[PDB]
Design a protein around this ligand. Structure first.
Ligand code: CL
Ligand code: CL
Ligand code: MG
Ligand code: MG
Ligand code: MG
Ligand code: MG
Ligand code: MG
Ligand code: MG
Ligand code: MG
Ligand code: MG
Ligand code: MG
Ligand code: MG
Ligand code: MG
Ligand code: MG
Ligand code: MG
Ligand code: MG
Ligand code: MG
Ligand code: MG
Ligand code: MG
Ligand code: MG
Ligand code: MG
Ligand code: MG
Ligand code: MG
Ligand code: MG
Ligand code: MG
Ligand code: MG
Lengths: 156, 197, 126, 61, 106
RNA sequence: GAAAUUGUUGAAAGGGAAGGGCAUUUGAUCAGACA
RNA sequence: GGAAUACUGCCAGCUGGGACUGAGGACUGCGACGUAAGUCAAGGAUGCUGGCAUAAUGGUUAUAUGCCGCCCGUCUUGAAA
RNA sequence: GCCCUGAAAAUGGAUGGCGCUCAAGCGUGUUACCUAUACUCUACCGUCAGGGUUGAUAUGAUGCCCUGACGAGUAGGCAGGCGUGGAGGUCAGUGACGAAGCCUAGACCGUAAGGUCGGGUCGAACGGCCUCUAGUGCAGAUCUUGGUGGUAGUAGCAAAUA
RNA sequence: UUGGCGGAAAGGCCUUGGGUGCUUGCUGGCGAAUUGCAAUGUCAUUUUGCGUGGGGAUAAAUCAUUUGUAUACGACUUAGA
């Protein structure tokens, strides 16, 4: 015998977990996040883009559109902590967004249906965008920080 | 904020300016000091001359080339005041000291650049009126600085060229200012006025 | 393969080396407690080496556990390997250093059939 | 820092088990350990402590 | 345009320290444009990245990053305290760091 | 066929010693799960 | 003559931002909200999602940087001496 | 009150240094801020104290578990452990298909004394556990014996005619 | 490309003429997706080496020998197609 066998062995059975008291409750967004608000993307592929906020999804994500015809940003999901809410608003009444949900963006080239509903959503948005002058040019440009810009004193 | 900050040493108190620059170098900002011969030190000229002679007599007894080195130039006097406020015997201190340049007068590389001032170290803003002060240029000459007249002659030549440049800049600014005022009273000007610009 | 365990924490991974074992060749690195009257190590002055003490003891739930989560048990033949038949999730077999090359082949084959983990299966491989 | 009014980590100073290695004596201690815990009878506690005593502390009767 | 910056420039000053002893686990960060503890409250919790270069390419890149965040203010002059996943090296005293705008409360 | 001590080869550092403690960068090198 | 405010104190008033921690492991206790069935922030963290599955994290080692570190043993009131 | 005279020592020199003059000096008042192995809360290790639990069919009642508090140390005391030569018992233990020894900025376990593994070298014996026993653990003693350095290719190898 | 100026470390500044690119001063039409909800997401300037071809230029020092204005040894100072 190279090593003396232990007289006691621990149990191989795995104990069950105690009952957890942590009930999931819906997220409350900050007051600046209202549908139709122009958002500035702070990270990701489309960082610095100015998009339009549409709907709040069930997985605590925000549904946004560029629109794709203006600045090339399609219907996507973003995180509320990675955007900046501006003071400008776009009317959303007349835009159908109840078809888009968490399962719509399942991961599993571009599909055909994604192209069609992009144009349907954007057409209503573009009509409302033309109401105010220089707003279309505003959405096409990208946000950036200049020399001397202090974010703690900037108003959006 | 600038990649290189050029400080005009005229009218600055030596000790207060040295503290400001030493912290800037340690924080990673390159500093250039010009016109070191126009620096000021509080106290009468005789007091500061006596202080330097006290510094002069300190030397290694068995070999004078080993002892403290007594640099007479105004730029090196300010450098001595600055090296004492930096841990110059460490690699961090050595790297900080390589971000600094001090010159007598304004050499050609920096005579066409912008010079700033440090209000914390300005003699006119710190010393009580009536208090006596000394100028570093004359103090250096009394302790053996040889190039006071050469710097004075070169600085006179620089000012003649600098004044001619300013005259043309003034004329162009008057032309630009008139056009901006003429461009006012327009719709674009009114919209800019409503937004603060 | 082992039972789930809490994250293993090592309070002091660095070896405790005897003072001045890097200064003289005759002083080995095996830990010895300084007992001199003036010793800076014994008096615990700032900037000196630290000394072993009971405060560094590891959590009893993760003590003696290898990073894979098993406890090492040295085996020398087939008979003592089979003592781990019902304890495959807590113990892993290690073959003794003096086991011949041909005997290691028999042990490894039996361990694979029983599902017993072996920590040194590449020893004496032709 | 604590200004202790008494010595720290002080043992009770009373035997909690027999010093001997007698297997049969340890069986009697095991029996009366159970009885003293679950009978609330002062007799059982006295007997259990008496089993821990050394030879000089158990004179013949 | 000519600018694409989405972060605030910062400088790594030193570790948390007394006169003679330093603490590498905490770094002191100076944020450009911040000169008041009240103003420094805006940047609490913001992510900080230190970006540097190496000769060897590892994961298809020759640029490496060390991540951290702002914990609390420091002093009366707008300095803040920061903690990084791995402690910043001491040679970066005076180097530049990037302070991002996320997580955002705007 | 150990150590002191020495040669060759390879790697690294060196502005009046060298060695050490805490932390991290860089280089080299390496175990553990892929259920 | 009639108020306000300052200063000090109280609230089993409301609410925003940041940091560190997640020990325990079937049930049992004390409470809360409910006509009830039940639910809950009430005797210790869960839910959702992404990238990578290898030297990426980490260990070891050499080096560099910041700060710190005087030679051990011995006698002694007192040792780097 | 502050300042000045009174006020002279030997290497060069020290409010710690730089330097500072409505101070970065002196007297006084009000706040903000910095940081100890101290204080508060949490985790983990150990120690002590008070308790729970023998019921078989699953293994340690010196076991397992619950609760609270505590932790500096020379001279010195006690306790639990690590390692070495030999002895009784046992593992029908390891081994010429390579035992012991040695080398190894390779891996793993332990707070530590140490233990285990891989690779290289090597050639004939050796180990785990329960106990017994001692000529049983070294950095020092101007320690004993043996071996080897820096000094150092240095001092020097110049009386007596060639 | 024209002309002028700058020696304190000038190595820069100003100016004439034409060619060509862009122009968000104003009005239009197309493209962007899938990096999947963030991951610096790579856009800088340091030095050196090996291969392309378009020009440019065809030496010295040291040892050995020799000198004594030099000299402990090195060094110094002279000479030699
Ligand atoms: Cl151990
Ligand atoms: Cl010669
Ligand atoms: Mg002279
Ligand atoms: Mg270890
Ligand atoms: Mg003592
Ligand atoms: Mg110890
Ligand atoms: Mg031999
Ligand atoms: Mg050797
Ligand atoms: Mg790493
Ligand atoms: Mg020191
Ligand atoms: Mg005495
Ligand atoms: Mg001593
Ligand atoms: Mg005061
Ligand atoms: Mg404390
Ligand atoms: Mg103690
Ligand atoms: Mg062998
Ligand atoms: Mg070795
Ligand atoms: Mg033989
Ligand atoms: Mg002996
Ligand atoms: Mg020893
Ligand atoms: Mg010895
Ligand atoms: Mg001793
Ligand atoms: Mg000796
Ligand atoms: Mg000789
Ligand atoms: Mg002789
Ligand atoms: Mg002779």
């Amino acid at each position: 015998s190279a090593q003396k066998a232990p007289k006691w062995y621990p149990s191989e059975d795995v104990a069950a977990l105690k009952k957890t008291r942590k009930a999931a409750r819906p997220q409350k967004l900050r007051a600046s996040l209202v549908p139709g608000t122009v958002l500035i993307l702070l990270a990701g592929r489309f960082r610095g883009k100015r998009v339009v906020y549409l709907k709040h999804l069930e997985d605590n994500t925000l549904l946004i559109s560029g629109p794709f015809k203006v600045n090339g940003v399609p219907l996507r999901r973003v995180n509320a902590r990675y955007v900046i809410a501006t003071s400008t608003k776009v009317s959303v009444e007349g835009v159908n967004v109840e078809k888009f949900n968490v399962e719509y963006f399942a991961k599993e080239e571009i599909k055909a249906e994604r192209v069609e509903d992009q144009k349907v959503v954007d057409k209503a948005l573009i009509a409302e965008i033309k109401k105010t002058p220089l707003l279309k040019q505003y959405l096409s440009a990208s946000f950036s920080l200049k020399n001397g810009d202090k974010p703690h004193m900037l108003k959006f | 904020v600038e990649p290189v900050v050029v400080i005009d040493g005229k009218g600055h108190l030596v000790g207060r300016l040295a503290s400001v620059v030493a912290k800037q170098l340690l924080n990673g900002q390159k500093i250039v000091v010009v016109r070191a011969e126009e620096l000021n030190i509080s106290g009468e000229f005789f007091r500061n001359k006596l202080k330097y002679h006290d510094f002069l007599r300190k030397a290694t007894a068995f070999n004078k080339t080993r002892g403290p080195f007594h640099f007479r130039a105004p730029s090196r006097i300010f450098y001595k005041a600055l090296r004492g406020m930096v841990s110059h015997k460490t690699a961090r201190g050595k790297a900080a000291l390589e971000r600094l340049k001090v010159f007598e007068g304004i050499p050609p590389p920096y005579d066409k650049k912008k010079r700033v001032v440090v209000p914390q170290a300005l003699r006119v803003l710190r010393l009580k009126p009536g208090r006596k002060y000394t100028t570093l240029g004359k103090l250096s000459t009394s302790v053996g600085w040889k190039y006071e007249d050469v710097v004075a002659k070169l600085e006179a030549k620089r000012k003649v060229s600098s004044a001619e440049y300013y005259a043309k800049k003034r004329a162009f600014t008057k032309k630009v200012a008139s056009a901006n005022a003429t461009a006012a009273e327009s719709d674009v000007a009114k919209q800019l006025a409503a937004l603060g610009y | 393969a082992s039972l789930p365990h809490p994250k293993i924490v090592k309070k002091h991974t660095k070896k405790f080396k005897r003072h001045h074992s890097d200064r003289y060749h005759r002083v080995a690195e095996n830990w010895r407690k300084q007992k001199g009257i003036d010793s800076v190590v014994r008096r615990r002055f700032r900037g000196n080496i630290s000394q072993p003490k009971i405060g560094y003891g590891s959590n009893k739930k993760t003590k003696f556990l290898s990073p894979s989560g098993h406890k090492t048990f040295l085996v020398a033949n087939v008979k003592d390997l089979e003592t781990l038949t019902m304890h495959t999730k807590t113990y892993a077999a290690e073959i003794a250093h003096n086991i011949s090359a041909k005997n290691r082949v028999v042990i490894l084959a039996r361990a694979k059939a029983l599902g017993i983990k072996v920590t040194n299966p590449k020893g004496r491989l032709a | 820092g604590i200004d202790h009014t008494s010595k720290q980590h002080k043992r009770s100073g009373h035997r909690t088990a027999p010093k001997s290695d007698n297997v049969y004596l340890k069986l009697l201690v095991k029996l009366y350990t159970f009885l003293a815990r679950r009978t609330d009878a002062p007799f059982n506690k006295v007997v259990l402590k008496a089993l821990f005593l050394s030879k000089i502390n158990r004179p013949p009767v | 345009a000519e600018s694409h910056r989405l972060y605030v420039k910062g400088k790594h000053l030193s570790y948390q320290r007394s006169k003679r002893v330093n603490n590498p686990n905490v770094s002191l960060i100076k944020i450009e444009g911040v000169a008041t503890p009240q103003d420094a409250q805006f940047y609490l919790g913001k992510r900080i990245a230190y970006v540097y270069r190496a000769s060897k390419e590892v994961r298809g890149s020759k640029i490496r990053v060390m991540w951290g965040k702002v914990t609390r203010t420091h002093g009366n002059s707008g300095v803040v305290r920061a903690t990084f996943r791995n402690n910043l090296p001491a040679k970066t005293f005076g180097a530049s760091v990037r302070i991002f705008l996320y997580p955002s409360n705007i």
